[PDB]
Each structure stands twice: as C-alpha cells, then as structure tokens.
Amino acid sequence: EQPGLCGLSNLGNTCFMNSAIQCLSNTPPLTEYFLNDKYQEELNFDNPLGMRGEIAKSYAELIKQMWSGKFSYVTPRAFKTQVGRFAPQFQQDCQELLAFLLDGLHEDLNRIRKKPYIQLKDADGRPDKVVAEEAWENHLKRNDSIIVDIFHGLFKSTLVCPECAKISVTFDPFCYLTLPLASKVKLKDCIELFTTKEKLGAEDPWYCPNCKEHQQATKKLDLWSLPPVLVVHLKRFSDKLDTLVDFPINDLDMSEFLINPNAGPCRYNLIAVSNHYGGMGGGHYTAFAKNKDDGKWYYFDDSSVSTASEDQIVSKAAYVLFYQRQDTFSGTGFFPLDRETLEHHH
Ligand SMILES: [Zn+2]
Fold first, then answer.
1. Of 249, 188, 248, whose CA–CA distance to 223 is shortest?
2. Residue 340 domain flag
3. Exactly one of 15, 175, 190, 266 is catalytic; which is it?
4. Would residue 270 count as lying in a domain?
5. Comparing C-alpha atoms, which of 277, 252, 275 is closest to residue 265?
6. Per the domain annotation, does 2 fall within a domain?
7. Is there a contact between 128 and 115 (Cβ–Cβ < 8 Å)?
8. N or C: which terminus of the chain has fewer CB atoms within 10 Å of its end residue's CB?
9. How far is the CA of 191 from the centre of ligand 1 (A)?
10. C-alpha separations of 171 from 128, 133, 161 in Å
11. Cα(210) to centroid of ligand 1, in Å?
C-alpha cells in the first residue's frame, strides 16, 4: 500500500464524513503538521470553545493510520465517535461537517490561552489597509493556530443604509467561501456573483447604528486576503442545484478579485474535490484528491481508492473544492514546518 492511498469504511450514512476527511487528509501542510507530531505541544485541553483536544487527537491518529502505508482502508470508528460526542447533529451536509472540523481543530490547537475582549469597530471613514491590518491583528490575538495559518483569509463587508447614507465597512475572517451558483457557469462567474452588491430583505435586516433602526441595506463583499488553502463551497442545497460549475485544475488566478494592492501572488492549483450524487437529505459523497507524494489524482469512494484522470474531476457532482496557493507548496519553505524540514535537510 502507498501512504495516503487509504479508503475509509462507511459506518452507516458516513460518506459525508469520509469525503470531508479525504479533502483534509489531502491538504499537505495539515497532514504534515500531524505526521511530524507538531500537534502534541499545541493541544489546548482547557479551551471552553474546543473539544478537550479530542477532535485534534482523534484526527491526528486517523491521519497517521491513513499515511502509514499499512492499510488499503481503515474504519474511522474513534474519530466518528468523537465527532458524534461533541457534535450530536452528525445523511448530512459535507460542508457543515467541514465547517465544524475547521472550527474544532482550530480551537483544539489554538495557541491563545485566554481570549481578550476586542472592541469591534467600523472603518469610520479610515483607509482599508489600516482597518484590514487592525482586523487581522485582532483576529490573531483571539485565534492563532495551524488552522489559521493554512485556511483563514479576510473579506471586507460594506453595508449601506438607504436612510442617512451610513456606509458601514468591516473586515471579517473566513476559513471557506460559500459561492452562490449563477445549466452551466464558470467558477469565476460564481466568484463575481459572491462579490456583487445585493439588497437584504425583511428576512435578516441590518441595524444602522446612526439611525438606531433595522434597514434593508445593500451588502457588498470583497476579498482582502486569500489563505494558502482556499476551500470553495458551491451553494447547491442552500432542493439541490445540479448546475455544472466549470473550475480549473491548475492556475486559478484570483488577483482580479483581491482589492489589497500590496498582496503577494494568488495563483491556486486544485488539490481535492468533495462530490455529491443524488438529492439533498440523501444521496452519496465521494472525493477526488491529488496525492502529495506522486502528484497523481485518485477517486475515494468510502473504502475504495482508484486512479482518476483529470478529465473526470470537473462534473456537476463537484460540491466543495480545495485549492492550494502555488507559493505555499512543499519545497518553497512557506510553512514553518516546510522551512524547518528544508533547513534540516540542507
Ligand atoms: Zn441609517
């Protein structure tokens, strides 16, 4: 058997979990962190928001199994049992589980011992660069982990009161982007739609702090900074949109969307896809992933692993896309673990 080419037993409508695990397992800087035992010293047992280290520990133990090269498949019973204990709601939505896991891993590994209270602020007519750099510093004072290092970006939100002209600007972290789907469209069409001005309705109004009243304000999102690993959730369920979204395998250039003039390169290659077949409350999840060792694509359908061709990856079954920024790849020294390993080996 080859490390990472390891299927996962279905334990009874757990294909949503197996699909999310194959995407994270095939996120190189995340797996490397766990295979190099960098997590033990960062486990945060006392965190009121975390899972007593139990999600990080069980996930670490499963990844070590999957990348040992001893197994054609493993049964992720202990991990499924810890997920169920801390998140009883877990056929599910693969994106909700991913959302739970990115937050749970983060809080289990969070380097901040005691979170300080931050007086949240509007731009107040200040320049974007200063408000963005403030937001990011504030985020890191409460949130500092391997999950932040890999997955967290920053978006700008602009709310416009139709009474009083109040322009409310905030910078907010994200660890994934949920895109609205526009028969066939391009991923870049979906990103453009994500960053388009939309009116809020009677459902979910915005409170104007000038007017002291709820308004149907216009909300525009813009991307300030994009993470090393960008997780792109295609909003199919919100019964299910079967729209064919065409996405690139290589050289997704995001630079046209980034409003930060001093940003570095933002070219991404695909590393995994969560697929979904059938309809909302049922159907079946699988995954495509690029193995970090051989650079080839494989298809993971619970316990089964098979070679895939790049020609099969782009289908309407594509639900969550994992992209990695080229400048962060293993061998660049971008990640501290990569840099330490390179410096050790040279
Ligand atoms: Zn107002």
1. 188
2. yes
3. 15
4. yes
5. 252
6. no
7. no
8. C
9. 29
10. 9, 9, 18
11. 5
233 in a structural domain = yes
Distance 209 CA to ligand 1 centre (A): 7
Domain of 105, CATH number, reads 3.90.70.10
Q: Quick one: 55 exposed, middle or buried, by C-beta within 10 A (0-12, 13-18, 19+)?
A: buried
- Annotated resolution, angstroms: 2.0
CA distance 341 to 21: 25
Q: Name the token pair of 208.
A: 């104007």
φ, ψ dihedrals at 158, nearest 5°: -115, 115
One-letter amino acid at 38 equals: K
Q: Report the amino acid identity of residue 8.
A: L
Q: Is 15 a catalytic residue?
A: yes
CA dihedral sign of residues 318, 320, 323, 324: negative
Please give the Cα distance from 82 to 102 (Å, whole number): 15
Q: How was this structure determined?
A: X-ray
Q: How many domains does the chain have?
A: 1
Ligand 1 centroid – CA 192 distance (Å): 27
Contact 220, 196 (CB under 8 A): yes
The gap from C-alpha 236 to its chain's centroid, in whole angstroms, comes to 17
Neighbours of 1 (CB within 10 A): 12
Ligand 1 centre to CA of 231 (Å) is 35
Residue 175 a catalytic site member: no
Distance 122 CA to ligand 1 centre (A): 14
Tell me which residue of 171, 169, 173 sits closest to 161, measured CA to CA. 169
Strand (E) positions, 235-338?
244-246, 252-253, 267-277, 284-290, 297-301, 304-307, 318-325
Instruction: Dig out the tokens for 124 from the structure.
Output: 């107040």
Which structural domain, as residue segments, surrounds residue 91? Answer: 7-345
